[PDB]
Amino acid sequence: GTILIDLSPDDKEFQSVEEEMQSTVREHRDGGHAGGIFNRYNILKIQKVCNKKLWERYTHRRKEVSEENHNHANERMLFHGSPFVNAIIHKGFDERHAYIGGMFGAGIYFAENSSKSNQYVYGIGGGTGCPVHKDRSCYICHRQLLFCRVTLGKSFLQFSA
Amino acid sequence: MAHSPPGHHSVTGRPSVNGLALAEYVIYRGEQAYPEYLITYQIMRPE
Ligand SMILES: O=c1[nH]c(-c2ccc(C(F)(F)F)cc2)nc2ccccc12
Ligand SMILES: [Zn+2]
């Protein structure tokens, strides 16, 4: 039941999503090893993901969290990069999209820096890079990220390197 | 999937070394996220 609606670059929604993508690039301590060497992106397309069933599943859970946290869902918009973006948009997030080895345990990870999610597009640590050229810094091949609505509720603060 | 720390719904990974890094977040229930935009892009070679 998923449909994808193209946003026009003239659309204010296209523009605000593009700006969050571009403005949250940073340099990475691997010197580009995982995600490539770049300061900015060439945005090719932004599509709205529309699935009624997946939306209702999110809003149901959002209300539960909110009622457990003085009516505060603590909702954010955050980036997710994954080799499984096509399965996610059709079936939703589930245990198969977890980072089993992540530093905060087996869960589904999101980033405020778009450039941090970019490091996972081709797998953990960038895998072997693009399928076509085996290049983690490929400037040719098309990449995809998700910009997601995430319910944090009461969040455990982990100070960390 | 693991569980959230008791009495919590997510984990916030606060950067404590790299002063320029923003936060990363973890959730342990798939129903706590909706993939709202699909962005297709290329990274650009710096000049
Ligand atoms: O966007 C992210 N994706 C992933 C991520 C990690 C692993 C996998 C999978 F194991 F390939 F399913 C898929 C996505 N990890 C992150 C860690 C920190 C901040 C952001 C991310
Ligand atoms: Zn390539």
CA B7 to chain centre: 20
Domain containing residue A23: 1-161
Domain chopping of chain B, boundaries: 1-47
After which residues do gaps appear in chain A, with C to N over 2.5 Å?
none
Supply A40's token pair: 């900015």
Q: Is the CB of A118 under 6 A from ligand 1?
A: no
- Concatenate the DSSP letters of all residues of A112-161 into one string: SSHHHHHTTTTSGGGTTS-TTT--TT-SSS-EEEEEEEEE--SEEEEEE-
CATH number, position A77: 3.90.228.10
DSSP at A4: E
How many domains does chain A divide into? 1
Q: Is the CB of A81 under 6 A from ligand 1?
A: yes
Distance between start and end Cα atoms, chain B: 43
- Owner of token pair 């946003």: A7
The beta strand positions in A10-60, using DSSP E, are 41-50
A156: left (phi over 0), alpha (psi -120 to 50) or beta: beta
Give per-residue burial for A109-148: e unless 16+ CB within 10 Å, then b: bbbbbbbbbbbbbbbeebeebbeeeeebbbeeeebbbbbb
Alpha-carbon gap, residue B24 to B15, rounded angstroms:
8
Alpha-carbon gap, residue A151 to B27, rounded angstroms:
8
Distance between start and end Cα atoms, chain A: 41
The experimental method, as deposited, was: X-ray
Beta-bridge mates of residue B33 = A150
Q: Does A50 show up as a binding residue in the annotation?
A: no
Measure in Å the smallest separation between the Cα of B30 and chain A Cα atoms. Answer: 5
Alpha-carbon gap, residue A55 to A72, rounded angstroms:
18
Supply A80's token pair: 């997710």
Q: What is the resolution of this structure in A?
A: 2.0
Domain B1-47 in CATH 3.40.630.10? The answer is no
3-state secondary structure of A97: helix
Beta-bridge mates of residue A111 = A79, B24
Which residues in chain A are closer than 8 Å to B19, comparing Cβ atoms? none
Q: What are phi and psi of A62, to 5 degrees?
A: -60, -40
Alpha-carbon gap, residue B5 to A159, rounded angstroms:
15
Per this entry, what is the length of chain B?
Answer: 47
3-state secondary structure A48-77: EEECHHHHHHHHHHHHHHHHCCCCCCCEEE
List Cα–Cα distances, A72 to A2, A77, A111, A159, in angstroms.
Answer: 28, 15, 21, 23
Alpha-carbon gap, residue B28 to B47, rounded angstroms:
41
As to burial, measured by CB atoms within 10 angstroms (0-12 exposed, 13-18 middle, 19+ buried), residue B45 is exposed
Supply B13's token pair: 């990974």
